[model samples]
Target: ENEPKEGIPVDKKITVNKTWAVDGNEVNKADETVDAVFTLQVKQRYGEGTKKIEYDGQTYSIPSLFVKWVNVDSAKATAATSFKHTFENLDNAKTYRVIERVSGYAPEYVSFVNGVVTIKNNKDSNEPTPI
Candidate 1:
Protein backbone atom coordinates (compact mmCIF):
# COMPACT_ATOMS: atom_id res chain seq x y z
CA GLU A 1 0.00 0.00 0.00
CA ASN A 2 1.60 3.24 -1.15
CA GLU A 3 -0.03 6.47 -0.21
CA PRO A 4 1.20 10.05 -0.19
CA LYS A 5 0.96 12.14 2.93
CA GLU A 6 -0.64 15.57 2.85
CA GLY A 7 1.29 18.56 4.09
CA ILE A 8 0.51 22.15 4.85
CA PRO A 9 0.42 24.46 1.88
CA VAL A 10 2.39 27.69 1.83
CA ASP A 11 1.16 30.98 0.49
CA LYS A 12 2.73 32.36 -2.69
CA LYS A 13 3.79 35.76 -3.90
CA ILE A 14 3.13 37.34 -7.28
CA THR A 15 5.14 40.25 -8.61
CA VAL A 16 4.32 42.46 -11.53
CA ASN A 17 7.02 44.61 -13.17
CA LYS A 18 6.37 47.55 -15.43
CA THR A 19 8.92 49.05 -17.81
CA TRP A 20 8.54 52.44 -19.42
CA ALA A 21 10.11 53.66 -22.65
CA VAL A 22 9.78 56.65 -24.91
CA ASP A 23 11.11 57.18 -28.43
CA GLY A 24 13.00 53.90 -28.13
CA ASN A 25 14.73 55.04 -24.94
CA GLU A 26 14.07 53.59 -21.54
CA VAL A 27 12.93 55.98 -18.81
CA ASN A 28 14.46 55.38 -15.41
CA LYS A 29 13.31 58.16 -13.10
CA ALA A 30 10.31 59.45 -11.25
CA ASP A 31 10.08 62.47 -13.53
CA GLU A 32 9.62 60.15 -16.45
CA THR A 33 6.76 58.39 -14.76
CA VAL A 34 3.47 58.66 -16.59
CA ASP A 35 -0.10 58.44 -15.37
CA ALA A 36 -0.24 54.69 -15.70
CA VAL A 37 -2.11 52.20 -13.56
CA PHE A 38 -1.85 48.44 -13.22
CA THR A 39 -4.15 45.79 -11.80
CA LEU A 40 -3.73 42.16 -10.80
CA GLN A 41 -6.38 39.48 -10.98
CA VAL A 42 -6.57 36.01 -9.51
CA LYS A 43 -9.19 33.27 -9.28
CA GLN A 44 -10.96 32.00 -6.18
CA ARG A 45 -14.07 30.01 -5.43
CA TYR A 46 -15.37 31.97 -2.43
CA GLY A 47 -15.63 35.70 -2.82
CA GLU A 48 -18.00 38.47 -3.77
CA GLY A 49 -18.74 39.59 -7.31
CA THR A 50 -17.83 36.31 -8.94
CA LYS A 51 -17.63 35.91 -12.68
CA LYS A 52 -17.31 33.17 -15.25
CA ILE A 53 -14.17 32.68 -17.30
CA GLU A 54 -12.85 30.18 -19.79
CA TYR A 55 -9.42 28.86 -18.88
CA ASP A 56 -7.41 25.88 -20.07
CA GLY A 57 -10.41 24.64 -22.09
CA GLN A 58 -12.68 24.72 -19.03
CA THR A 59 -15.26 27.16 -17.79
CA TYR A 60 -14.74 28.50 -14.28
CA SER A 61 -17.23 30.37 -12.11
CA ILE A 62 -15.08 32.06 -9.52
CA PRO A 63 -14.53 35.47 -8.05
CA SER A 64 -11.37 37.42 -8.67
CA LEU A 65 -9.24 36.78 -5.64
CA PHE A 66 -6.95 39.75 -5.77
CA VAL A 67 -7.97 42.93 -7.52
CA LYS A 68 -5.80 45.90 -6.59
CA TRP A 69 -4.51 48.92 -8.42
CA VAL A 70 -1.01 50.36 -8.35
CA ASN A 71 0.20 53.51 -9.95
CA VAL A 72 3.41 54.18 -11.89
CA ASP A 73 4.34 56.95 -9.46
CA SER A 74 5.19 54.24 -6.97
CA ALA A 75 8.12 53.26 -9.17
CA LYS A 76 11.62 53.46 -7.90
CA ALA A 77 15.19 52.93 -9.11
CA THR A 78 15.45 49.27 -9.94
CA ALA A 79 17.69 47.06 -12.06
CA ALA A 80 15.74 47.85 -15.25
CA THR A 81 14.23 51.24 -14.49
CA SER A 82 10.87 49.78 -13.70
CA PHE A 83 8.19 49.58 -11.04
CA LYS A 84 7.03 46.39 -9.36
CA HIS A 85 4.24 45.31 -7.03
CA THR A 86 4.18 42.10 -5.08
CA PHE A 87 0.97 40.50 -3.91
CA GLU A 88 1.23 38.13 -0.99
CA ASN A 89 -0.78 35.29 0.52
CA LEU A 90 -1.75 33.84 -2.81
CA ASP A 91 -2.28 30.26 -3.88
CA ASN A 92 0.67 29.00 -5.85
CA ALA A 93 -1.49 26.71 -7.92
CA LYS A 94 -3.82 29.49 -9.04
CA THR A 95 -3.35 31.61 -12.16
CA TYR A 96 -3.01 35.39 -12.41
CA ARG A 97 -3.22 38.18 -14.96
CA VAL A 98 -1.79 41.72 -14.95
CA ILE A 99 -3.43 44.56 -16.81
CA GLU A 100 -1.98 47.94 -17.80
CA ARG A 101 -4.09 51.09 -18.01
CA VAL A 102 -2.74 54.21 -19.67
CA SER A 103 -3.66 56.66 -22.34
CA GLY A 104 -0.45 57.91 -23.93
CA TYR A 105 1.45 54.66 -23.87
CA ALA A 106 0.97 51.28 -25.48
CA PRO A 107 1.96 47.93 -24.09
CA GLU A 108 4.72 46.45 -26.21
CA TYR A 109 5.78 43.28 -24.46
CA VAL A 110 4.18 41.19 -21.74
CA SER A 111 5.47 37.93 -20.36
CA PHE A 112 5.16 35.78 -17.27
CA VAL A 113 8.16 33.75 -16.09
CA ASN A 114 8.96 32.27 -12.71
CA GLY A 115 6.20 34.10 -10.84
CA VAL A 116 7.13 37.45 -12.31
CA VAL A 117 4.96 39.27 -14.83
CA THR A 118 6.97 41.73 -16.91
CA ILE A 119 5.23 44.42 -18.91
CA LYS A 120 6.83 46.97 -21.21
CA ASN A 121 5.11 50.09 -22.47
CA ASN A 122 6.11 52.52 -25.20
CA LYS A 123 4.87 56.03 -25.69
CA ASP A 124 2.43 56.49 -28.51
CA SER A 125 3.55 58.50 -31.49
CA ASN A 126 1.94 61.84 -32.15
CA GLU A 127 -0.88 61.79 -34.66
CA PRO A 128 -0.38 63.67 -37.90
CA THR A 129 -2.47 66.82 -38.47
CA PRO A 130 -5.37 66.38 -40.81
CA ILE A 131 -5.23 68.54 -43.93
Candidate 2:
Protein backbone atom coordinates (compact mmCIF):
# COMPACT_ATOMS: atom_id res chain seq x y z
CA GLU A 1 0.00 0.00 0.00
CA ASN A 2 1.20 3.53 -0.87
CA GLU A 3 0.41 6.56 1.20
CA PRO A 4 -0.65 9.79 -0.53
CA LYS A 5 1.78 12.68 -0.91
CA GLU A 6 1.22 15.68 1.31
CA GLY A 7 0.13 18.00 -1.53
CA ILE A 8 1.19 19.92 -4.60
CA PRO A 9 2.74 23.34 -4.14
CA VAL A 10 0.75 26.45 -5.01
CA ASP A 11 2.41 29.62 -6.18
CA LYS A 12 1.18 33.19 -5.97
CA LYS A 13 1.87 35.99 -8.45
CA ILE A 14 3.61 39.28 -7.64
CA THR A 15 3.26 42.12 -10.06
CA VAL A 16 4.46 45.73 -10.34
CA ASN A 17 2.98 48.57 -12.35
CA LYS A 18 4.77 51.82 -13.26
CA THR A 19 3.96 54.98 -15.18
CA TRP A 20 6.27 57.80 -16.25
CA ALA A 21 4.54 61.02 -17.24
CA VAL A 22 5.56 64.64 -17.82
CA ASP A 23 3.28 67.65 -17.74
CA GLY A 24 0.31 65.33 -17.60
CA ASN A 25 1.43 63.83 -20.90
CA GLU A 26 2.73 60.28 -21.35
CA VAL A 27 5.90 59.45 -23.19
CA ASN A 28 5.52 55.93 -24.47
CA LYS A 29 8.66 55.88 -26.57
CA ALA A 30 11.49 56.56 -24.24
CA ASP A 31 15.01 55.94 -25.44
CA GLU A 32 16.04 54.15 -22.29
CA THR A 33 14.82 51.27 -20.19
CA VAL A 34 13.49 51.80 -16.67
CA ASP A 35 15.01 49.69 -13.95
CA ALA A 36 13.89 48.89 -10.43
CA VAL A 37 14.63 46.60 -7.49
CA PHE A 38 12.28 44.46 -5.53
CA THR A 39 12.67 43.27 -1.97
CA LEU A 40 10.93 40.05 -1.01
CA GLN A 41 9.92 39.15 2.50
CA VAL A 42 8.40 35.91 3.54
CA LYS A 43 5.67 35.92 6.12
CA GLN A 44 6.98 35.65 9.65
CA ARG A 45 4.68 32.74 10.25
CA TYR A 46 6.42 30.78 7.51
CA GLY A 47 9.88 31.97 8.50
CA GLU A 48 11.47 31.60 5.08
CA GLY A 49 10.24 28.13 4.27
CA THR A 50 11.88 25.91 1.69
CA LYS A 51 10.41 23.87 -1.09
CA LYS A 52 11.29 20.24 -1.61
CA ILE A 53 11.37 18.85 -5.10
CA GLU A 54 12.44 15.80 -7.01
CA TYR A 55 14.52 16.62 -10.05
CA ASP A 56 15.97 13.90 -12.31
CA GLY A 57 15.21 11.40 -9.58
CA GLN A 58 17.20 13.49 -7.14
CA THR A 59 15.56 15.36 -4.29
CA TYR A 60 16.43 19.03 -3.80
CA SER A 61 15.47 21.83 -1.52
CA ILE A 62 15.11 25.39 -2.79
CA PRO A 63 15.32 28.52 -0.70
CA SER A 64 12.95 31.47 -0.72
CA LEU A 65 13.11 33.66 -3.82
CA PHE A 66 13.97 37.29 -4.49
CA VAL A 67 13.76 39.57 -7.53
CA LYS A 68 15.89 42.17 -9.33
CA TRP A 69 15.14 44.22 -12.41
CA VAL A 70 17.19 44.83 -15.54
CA ASN A 71 16.84 47.03 -18.63
CA VAL A 72 13.02 46.96 -18.73
CA ASP A 73 11.68 48.45 -21.94
CA SER A 74 9.29 51.31 -21.35
CA ALA A 75 8.24 51.50 -24.99
CA LYS A 76 4.94 50.13 -26.29
CA ALA A 77 3.20 51.38 -23.19
CA THR A 78 0.75 54.23 -23.76
CA ALA A 79 -0.95 55.01 -20.46
CA ALA A 80 0.51 52.58 -17.95
CA THR A 81 3.25 49.99 -17.63
CA SER A 82 3.47 46.78 -15.71
CA PHE A 83 5.85 44.02 -14.70
CA LYS A 84 5.10 40.59 -13.22
CA HIS A 85 6.95 37.86 -11.40
CA THR A 86 6.07 34.80 -9.31
CA PHE A 87 6.75 34.02 -5.70
CA GLU A 88 7.81 30.79 -4.02
CA ASN A 89 5.54 27.88 -4.66
CA LEU A 90 3.22 26.82 -1.85
CA ASP A 91 3.97 30.18 -0.26
CA ASN A 92 1.51 32.79 -1.29
CA ALA A 93 2.02 34.03 2.25
CA LYS A 94 4.52 36.72 1.38
CA THR A 95 4.85 40.50 1.06
CA TYR A 96 6.91 42.59 -1.37
CA ARG A 97 8.19 46.12 -1.93
CA VAL A 98 9.78 47.91 -4.91
CA ILE A 99 12.23 50.73 -5.50
CA GLU A 100 13.26 52.65 -8.61
CA ARG A 101 16.31 54.84 -9.20
CA VAL A 102 16.44 57.22 -12.15
CA SER A 103 19.67 58.68 -13.47
CA GLY A 104 20.30 62.05 -15.14
CA TYR A 105 21.53 65.52 -14.15
CA ALA A 106 19.09 65.17 -11.25
CA PRO A 107 18.40 61.67 -9.98
CA GLU A 108 15.27 60.48 -8.23
CA TYR A 109 13.87 57.54 -6.32
CA VAL A 110 10.37 56.13 -6.54
CA SER A 111 8.82 53.43 -4.41
CA PHE A 112 5.73 51.26 -4.65
CA VAL A 113 3.92 48.80 -2.46
CA ASN A 114 1.46 46.57 -4.33
CA GLY A 115 0.30 49.55 -6.36
CA VAL A 116 1.11 51.77 -9.32
CA VAL A 117 4.24 53.93 -9.14
CA THR A 118 4.09 57.21 -11.01
CA ILE A 119 7.18 59.25 -11.88
CA LYS A 120 7.17 62.80 -13.18
CA ASN A 121 9.21 66.05 -13.49
CA ASN A 122 12.32 64.61 -15.10
CA LYS A 123 13.36 67.86 -16.65
CA ASP A 124 13.92 71.53 -15.77
CA SER A 125 11.65 73.59 -17.98
CA ASN A 126 12.65 76.87 -16.37
CA GLU A 127 16.07 76.75 -17.97
CA PRO A 128 16.73 77.46 -21.64
CA THR A 129 18.05 73.98 -22.12
CA PRO A 130 18.84 72.31 -25.42
CA ILE A 131 19.38 68.59 -25.45
Candidate 3:
Protein backbone atom coordinates (compact mmCIF):
# COMPACT_ATOMS: atom_id res chain seq x y z
CA GLU A 1 0.00 0.00 0.00
CA ASN A 2 1.16 3.55 -0.79
CA GLU A 3 1.34 6.18 1.91
CA PRO A 4 -1.06 9.10 1.78
CA LYS A 5 0.34 12.36 0.54
CA GLU A 6 -0.10 15.82 1.99
CA GLY A 7 -2.94 17.95 0.74
CA ILE A 8 -2.39 20.90 -1.55
CA PRO A 9 -2.28 24.36 -0.16
CA VAL A 10 -5.11 26.79 -0.72
CA ASP A 11 -4.85 30.37 -1.94
CA LYS A 12 -6.08 33.20 0.22
CA LYS A 13 -7.15 36.69 -0.81
CA ILE A 14 -7.08 39.84 1.29
CA THR A 15 -8.57 43.20 0.39
CA VAL A 16 -8.16 46.68 1.82
CA ASN A 17 -10.68 49.47 1.36
CA LYS A 18 -10.41 53.10 2.33
CA THR A 19 -12.78 56.04 2.47
CA TRP A 20 -12.00 59.71 2.96
CA ALA A 21 -14.09 62.24 4.77
CA VAL A 22 -13.83 65.97 5.48
CA ASP A 23 -15.74 67.92 8.09
CA GLY A 24 -17.84 64.86 8.93
CA ASN A 25 -18.95 64.40 5.31
CA GLU A 26 -17.61 61.72 2.99
CA VAL A 27 -15.70 63.12 0.06
CA ASN A 28 -15.08 61.34 -3.19
CA LYS A 29 -14.38 64.26 -5.47
CA ALA A 30 -11.42 64.62 -7.74
CA ASP A 31 -9.95 67.49 -5.74
CA GLU A 32 -10.47 65.75 -2.42
CA THR A 33 -7.84 63.08 -2.71
CA VAL A 34 -5.82 61.55 0.08
CA ASP A 35 -2.88 59.22 -0.17
CA ALA A 36 -3.46 56.27 2.12
CA VAL A 37 -1.15 53.39 2.88
CA PHE A 38 -1.89 50.07 4.48
CA THR A 39 0.27 47.33 5.94
CA LEU A 40 -0.65 43.71 6.57
CA GLN A 41 1.21 41.26 8.77
CA VAL A 42 0.60 37.57 8.49
CA LYS A 43 0.62 35.40 11.59
CA GLN A 44 0.69 31.65 11.46
CA ARG A 45 -1.26 29.59 13.94
CA TYR A 46 1.69 27.37 14.60
CA GLY A 47 5.26 28.43 15.29
CA GLU A 48 7.03 30.60 12.76
CA GLY A 49 9.47 28.60 10.68
CA THR A 50 10.24 27.42 7.19
CA LYS A 51 8.69 24.31 5.72
CA LYS A 52 10.38 21.81 3.47
CA ILE A 53 8.50 19.77 0.92
CA GLU A 54 9.34 17.26 -1.76
CA TYR A 55 7.81 17.51 -5.18
CA ASP A 56 8.67 15.60 -8.34
CA GLY A 57 11.78 14.12 -6.70
CA GLN A 58 13.05 17.54 -5.74
CA THR A 59 13.15 19.16 -2.32
CA TYR A 60 12.04 22.75 -1.84
CA SER A 61 12.05 25.01 1.17
CA ILE A 62 9.41 27.70 1.47
CA PRO A 63 10.30 30.76 3.50
CA SER A 64 8.01 32.73 5.70
CA LEU A 65 5.81 35.45 4.22
CA PHE A 66 5.49 39.04 5.35
CA VAL A 67 4.32 42.35 3.88
CA LYS A 68 5.83 45.74 4.54
CA TRP A 69 3.76 48.56 3.12
CA VAL A 70 1.27 49.04 0.29
CA ASN A 71 -0.23 52.31 -0.79
CA VAL A 72 -3.39 53.33 -2.65
CA ASP A 73 -4.77 56.68 -3.72
CA SER A 74 -8.23 57.28 -2.33
CA ALA A 75 -9.40 59.43 -5.19
CA LYS A 76 -12.52 57.90 -6.63
CA ALA A 77 -15.48 60.02 -7.57
CA THR A 78 -17.96 57.16 -7.73
CA ALA A 79 -16.80 54.59 -5.22
CA ALA A 80 -14.38 53.89 -2.41
CA THR A 81 -10.73 53.23 -3.24
CA SER A 82 -9.47 49.73 -2.57
CA PHE A 83 -6.56 47.37 -3.13
CA LYS A 84 -6.21 43.60 -2.89
CA HIS A 85 -3.46 41.03 -2.62
CA THR A 86 -3.60 37.29 -3.12
CA PHE A 87 -1.42 34.74 -1.36
CA GLU A 88 -0.69 31.54 -3.24
CA ASN A 89 -0.02 28.23 -1.52
CA LEU A 90 -0.63 29.80 1.87
CA ASP A 91 -2.15 28.03 4.83
CA ASN A 92 -5.79 28.99 5.39
CA ALA A 93 -5.59 28.69 9.14
CA LYS A 94 -3.43 31.77 9.56
CA THR A 95 -4.46 35.19 10.87
CA TYR A 96 -3.75 38.69 9.62
CA ARG A 97 -3.46 42.21 10.96
CA VAL A 98 -4.18 45.35 8.97
CA ILE A 99 -3.03 48.86 9.78
CA GLU A 100 -3.65 52.21 8.14
CA ARG A 101 -0.98 54.87 7.95
CA VAL A 102 -1.88 58.46 7.16
CA SER A 103 -0.17 61.75 7.76
CA GLY A 104 -2.81 64.47 8.17
CA TYR A 105 -5.87 62.35 8.65
CA ALA A 106 -7.10 60.14 11.44
CA PRO A 107 -8.97 56.93 11.12
CA GLU A 108 -12.54 57.35 12.29
CA TYR A 109 -13.57 53.77 11.86
CA VAL A 110 -11.90 50.53 10.94
CA SER A 111 -13.19 47.04 10.47
CA PHE A 112 -11.81 43.66 9.57
CA VAL A 113 -14.10 40.86 8.52
CA ASN A 114 -13.96 37.91 6.14
CA GLY A 115 -10.46 38.77 4.97
CA VAL A 116 -11.52 42.30 4.14
CA VAL A 117 -10.28 45.45 5.82
CA THR A 118 -12.18 48.72 5.65
CA ILE A 119 -10.97 52.05 6.98
CA LYS A 120 -12.51 55.50 7.11
CA ASN A 121 -10.32 58.52 7.66
CA ASN A 122 -11.36 62.00 8.65
CA LYS A 123 -9.55 65.28 8.50
CA ASP A 124 -7.56 65.85 11.63
CA SER A 125 -8.41 68.85 13.72
CA ASN A 126 -4.81 69.41 14.68
CA GLU A 127 -3.63 69.72 11.12
CA PRO A 128 -2.25 73.09 10.21
CA THR A 129 -4.20 75.31 7.85
CA PRO A 130 -3.11 75.29 4.24
CA ILE A 131 -1.72 78.45 2.69
Q: Tell me, by lDDT, which candidate is best.
A: 1
Identify the candidate with maximal TM-score.
Answer: 1
Q: Write the per-residue lDDT of candidate 1 for residues 1-131, one digit (tens) a residue.
A: 11111111135866666777778788776555466665555533453566798999999997656543322122223233577777667667765555556677776546577777667767787978998
In order of listing, the candidates' clash counts read: 0, 1, 0
Off by over 4 Å in 2: 1-11, 33-90, 104-131
Candidate lDDT (C-alpha), each: 0.58, 0.36, 0.51
* Candidate 3 Cα misplacement greater than 4 A, ranges: 1-11, 44-90, 126-131
Worst 10 residues of 3 by lDDT: 1-10
Candidate 1 or 2, higher lDDT? 1
Candidate closer to the true structure by TM-score (higher is better), 1 or 3: 1
lDDT of 1: 0.58
Model 1 misses residue 118 by how many Å?
0.5
TM-score of candidate 3 relative to the true fold? 0.50
| Per-prediction TM-score to the true structure, in the order listed | 0.57, 0.35, 0.50
